[model samples]
Target chain A: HHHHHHMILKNFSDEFQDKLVLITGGSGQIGSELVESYLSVSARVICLDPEQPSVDYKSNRFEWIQADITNRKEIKEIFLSLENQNKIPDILINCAGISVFTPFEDRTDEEFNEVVHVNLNGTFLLSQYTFRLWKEKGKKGIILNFGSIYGVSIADMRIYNSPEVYAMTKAGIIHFTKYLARYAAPYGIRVNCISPGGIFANQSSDFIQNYIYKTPLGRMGNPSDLVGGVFFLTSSLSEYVTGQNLLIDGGFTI
Target chain B: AHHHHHHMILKNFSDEFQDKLVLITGGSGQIGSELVESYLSVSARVICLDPEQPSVDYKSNRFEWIQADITNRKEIKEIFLSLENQNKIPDILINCAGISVFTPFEDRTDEEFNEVVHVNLNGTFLLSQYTFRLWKEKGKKGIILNFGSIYGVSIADMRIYNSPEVYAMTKAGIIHFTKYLARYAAPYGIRVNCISPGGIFANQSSDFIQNYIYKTPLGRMGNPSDLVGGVFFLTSSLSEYVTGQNLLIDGGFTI
Candidate 1:
């Protein structure tokens, strides 16, 4: 019990000490774990989602905000409030997304826009505001956009149910990341995107089997599996990196 | 001789690389410019050499743009001497200069084939050879990053109209080339790696995009910037113990 538990801050640990991180969709599978990972390093986290986080954290470093990221007025309000309180975030993680996997022919137009609004438009709006805040403060910040392996690869017909619109939106995220990285470099702000493969979520056995057989690693990723790559991009360890999409698929897209 | 099960242990390397001099060939191309800007963002002094001027106006005191063709041996040697004169030998050499020519496999002429080889394979060999000799003579640690394509690791989709046969062959050559050099340069504290990128979206015909979407498991094409992290990771201490590797950023296009 006498031993200090602080990680030596090398190789994997990029100290997030006191750095404010604004995470959208913090209640989601990947977002929650990312929050836990960041908290382990003593960073202040603002978790934004329509639903309160399912997981509980006792630390003051973690804050929960109930807001729809798709709402521009709400996003603007949050930033302005944070700015007034002098608590601007050093990083913004856009992870709020929803996928309705109906067949293309059966999908309704209203259903289609729902995914686009949440995944693409919401991320775009949040990012625009984040960039404005960072620029206005003359502070350099990091932005990580969540992209899917579907961002680049065609969805497998056998396993994936509804993929076209989701893939297109994620693809936009990947390309948008590069665009932002280019222009943001001039302002000392770095932008990157992460494209993760299927994370295990207690899915149907058939889907799991097919996924495992295809992946080179012979397994699907858990939420924790992605934390390391996120840590790398968020930290100075990747200071020389920008406008890049780091793929964390278990060689599934091999 | 089962190698007696002797394992070699490696020491940890630092990720901090400020002010490291980097030399990039093909610095005028799309991927090359992204790299130049990335390295420059981290305060690394960059020497960008290309036959053409950089596509973007990268205004930085740490950046030095040189116009030189990689295929010309005389020009490459002269640049080496100039760098030597200035005592600014690069710590990292990124071989990004390449040519992709589209021709039917049966219809490609001898001259066209040779031109692609001269620019892609021959130029890479000459530059890598000189850099290896310099690093070996000085006993300095160096890194080399080569650009490959998903076409090198897998066959291109036939439906895509402009898929270049020569481009695939040269890129495949680059992947193996990095492996060959890595083993030879290891003893001299030099590391070499290659990155194979997928079809980056730059305005293609709807048919081609549809074909790419159908074939690629990730469901869409890549952005040029998607190639950045792999390059930076391979060149940094994040992958210090990593050598003789080919990292694919194609979103499982090969699969």
Candidate 2:
């Protein structure tokens, strides 16, 4: 019943080869897998993260840039350096995100603000900068943002101990993707989002079991399960697709 | 930029859909017509049920048009049985048939409200249940895709002229019904889903278009072509893990 293996697109070299891909949150579980996937297909990759990547990938086509995406000045400098080097990214993946599991009564302003800054503001900054560069160069580009199933569906208090701050920002990003896609369509650019269900992150067994019982596919998602959808949105295969959210939740939110 | 192309290529699932028996309600309408054409192009045998004849002449034997009212259960039952005799049980059912009355809620007549509910809500119920029963008795796996509107999830702005309140109500019912039915039908190997489209550009007054676009994050009204991708994804194996979900293809207008 493991259908994820079929989700991966084969022979993406024709579409991704020699293209520059810039991804945020590259040190995280899902982000690192995306980095490896792009590099495996001969795409030049730049990973932006405050922390170093967990995986040590050996590839001349890949570069890990240490930077915090929420800081506009740091992001601007990275874009400038890439522009000077004539390495404008053909695609941007807003994968970096943070969340707090505190209850509503105990949720701090700092916790809420941090999640918003990283998940929502970071997405906006990267997408805006990428669109500006692509527009100036008269080139078409693709952007794929990451959202959680919580963005669309409310968090089940039984399964999640947190409030709605993370859910709110993720929903904002989903909306922003649509707004950006409309503006970018005329320029031949595409903006889309992926709202993934619970990915297996070595959480408590009780949480995992509860999540699995609620999920129709009878399991939590793996990082690899998201690879196919991310590739589909970035590829020409979905040329007519934009301003949409592809839910990769094994039917949990359904 | 007005670059909406009606011609679509189903590169991802063309082979999977080849020779599959598919049933479409309101196949002569704006979105349904495009769906018929797309499915036909992929070599799927399409049986279109509509009160009126098709808008386009599909010069293929694989295409069949049946004049029928979806709101009438007897007519739907006959069609199913007739198809059964022909050894053509549909592998997929698309409830794309819908109608709307443009009058204000205060001004809406009983006829307007009933007609909208009968077609949008009742018709969807009749078709989906029938298909599910057939799939269950035959021990076959099938798919049912229902069309919903953004108005169902988000309230319509009364400022937009002719915002059909009853249309929104029925669509909301259809969406929730999809979830309820999906859970009941899951063990039987039938997948049910809904696609809620935002405002599709239907040549409304420039004033209405402007007002709608202003509120829309996408800055433009949706074209029928914009919704085709979502339709294809929800119906194909790409969404094998998806069911009982309402996918909004509204260009972030609701957001």
Candidate 3:
């Protein structure tokens, strides 16, 4: 009880009291937790995901929309619908993505295409729609991306460990984000990435033994561990932090 | 003994082999371990922080020498002297040197500036100079550099985590290394760039929770297990064809 009261005392917690926020992949592990934090502060959140998260909707403050964010027309429709509801989000967070791990030799064109379409292309589609919509209304908004540690350090660790194909696409996504950041910064969009280190989740057992040695943290991360950084990026506190990827790993890549 | 036999069974690995041989930094870490596997038949021998590691002569008929330090002149000089005696110097040099954080910001950085200057800059300087000397004598060389995740991504885990000043300098050195290599290569012959990433050292330490991960395409990174792509790039024939850049391998976390 005492801890809960003091969370907001320092003006310390970076949650929105009445802010309108939109999140893609909002029902997933990390994304859902963010929804909870935002709602606690009286912020209204609109989430888009393939299915409703198992987390029960505790407040009317959140509206969950089941939509495929990668389908350009479908994503646009969600935006239009939200606008019709007088619910244009002040912040946009993209976390919807597919994981790729098939060996390069065995993987096909579809695997490559799917990862890029959902992760990189879908992100751009949403950003383009929001950027133009907000610009016309003369609104200043925040755009947060989730590029991973694999972006800059791919060359060092991908050969035998990662599937060549997935690493290649990740490399492409990395450059895509860099170019996007340069262009979007002037408009107050504050484009950046939040690269995470090892998170504890659905990874295989063999992976833990050989792969764990690479991380300085020595173990995986949890979804809740990310709330601090997610809040930091969306708040006004990161005003100068535009066009950058804010990595939130356990200093794993050092 | 059968495991020993399996280890002895060395064959070709990549087209990346000896068509190029590059240098690596923090040569003793996890990624550096796998980097050796990638080297296979392509490299003449791998040059790293440990020219003699694992307490073994590490008898590789294909391996060669140059035992340089990443920080001090005298330290690296002794290595270079040994190299002079052996008459075996690298055709390419890389600085894979790096450091990590788990201690709170205050627990770290008593001589923060000096620490960075010694390992990242000073070590890079002496190592590059000595190797660049050899590259000049040979008329050209391949040089790749190892940078930090903080150099590219803005880390957002712990409070007062990494010092502002040191992070600034690390990036500054990379920016300069990019231009200087572009500029320097025109003379004696060397190409250099910085590779920065996040959460790559999972096996190097303990205490994962205090470490936070917020955003990124691929949710989490493995250990140094992923650096082969970048290290191979600046040193191989593929990159033999490219230079003057900084590659950030974080999985679109900057997005």
Candidate 4:
């Protein structure tokens, strides 16, 4: 009876029924969880990642496409094939991202370039291809970009010693969301960004403690904590919300 | 019945703002008037300061008008002293007073540029500092909301129209000022924020309107009413954790 009451009171299954959701970097910690969540809602999901998912999601609505988002030619081909089959995605989540922890002085050119190509350039390629397909078909689409608190605020050097390149790219992505949302709105497409704070992923205890001390919630976020915000932005609940970056931090950035 | 429908559609947080004293500069302008009406709807006492009287005759005992220039330091001081004499210090300050010139960049004179900076930038600084000092001295928490523009974040599209570059610069400064002041005022429990709107449909040329709408993702120019919700949120309990940020209500025009 308790389970039934909970189910009846809160259900996102009906909101995303029969919709196609495309996710980049869908094999990673947060991305895999998102893939499963969408599939649970009866939305058909296509996960693009370079490596296969460790969790074998045995669902008829799920498909894993092995691909690198940084490869423009391969990404273009994937979109062209999807278009031919009338499977243009209704929603695209640019969740794929990478970072380097080296200090600014010690960071190599290769390390910086790799992070930029995958995080920033990959988002641009996918968004452009998706926009073009939707424009040609006269269909509405939604793009949700992944940004971080580092993009809006400086990372505490005392907590985590890192270079500025990752923060720089994330800042770029947040601004890119605004510019793209402006351009896509005429076609009835909406674009937004979700900037999350520190999420627990089995980091060193000292690091976790330092992060938790600064967060008002007194805990690092779970991957599931981000699911609610993602659903809100993609669903009709946020129909009037676009070109905005919703910070899901526990008052850390504030 | 129609008015009732409007009230029902908009969620009422009037209980939170009831009896709060609000001060609005440029309270006679298009956006400012809407803010005035919104606050009055929630039963907040409003004091409007502007050079000209409001276009709408709000027949409410809670509403009062004062003619004062914000850029004049002496006048601002006197106005604060006058309010203090009556035991009415504003709990919230909304800096909406601003001016823009439509002259082409090539033809823009030094006077036009200086006037925009004087009213938009200098006025904001003077009022905010006075309010900060007042609230600090009184040991009270307060809110300050500054009006900015989308042109501050992104470059203006020349194809649409020649937006005054000086207007953009002042807005950019105000946006940064919100951040700097928010950090400084946080020690005293004062929160500062900004709202930057895109193109609102005033009576512009048909050609300009058409071009503007074509580029706007929402496929329409904004109505003055569209900006009211953002202002309400920033000043209300809904955005209690939000500060030192600029909320852009451009309908995806500047996206």
Better of 1 and 4 by lDDT: 4
Q: Model 3 over residues A175-243: C-alpha lDDT tens digits?
A: 655666656554545566666655666666666654455543345566666665676567643443445
Q: Could you give candidate 4's per-residue lDDT for residues A145-233 as a string of tens digits?
A: 99999999899888855458889999999999988987788788989998888889868888889997876545677778777668766
TM-score of chain B of each: 0.91, 0.95, 0.76, 0.95
Clash number for candidate 3: 65
Q: For model 2, how does the per-residue alpha-carbon lDDT over B35-63 read when each residue is reduced to its tens digit?
A: 89778866789999999999778778999
Q: How many clashes show up per model?
A: 12, 0, 65, 4
Answer with 1 or 3, whichever has the higher lDDT: 1
Best-to-worst ranking by lDDT: 2, 4, 1, 3
Top of the candidates by DockQ: 2
Itemize residue pairs with steric clashes in candidate 2. none
Question: Could you tell me the TM-score of chain A in candidate 4?
Answer: 0.95
- Preferred candidate (TM-score higher): 3 or 4: 4
TM-score of chain A for the candidates in order shown: 0.94, 0.94, 0.87, 0.95
- Which digits, one per residue and each the tens of the lDDT, describe model 4 over residues B1-255? 122213212223466678589999999999899889878766789999899899987778999999999989999999999998898899899999988998789999999999999999999999999999999999978899999998889878887766899998999999899877876786677778898888888889999999988767788888777777667666765555456778777767665
Over 4 Å off, model 4: A1-144, A152-157, A161-176, A179-183, A196-241, A246-254, B1-5, B8-12, B105-110, B157-162
Which candidate wins on TM-score?
2
lDDT of 1 by residue, B15-58 (tens): 35464899999988888887887676556789998988887665
Best by lDDT: 2
DockQ (Cα-based) per candidate? Answer: 0.02, 0.19, 0.02, 0.12
Give the candidate order by descending TM-score: 2, 4, 1, 3
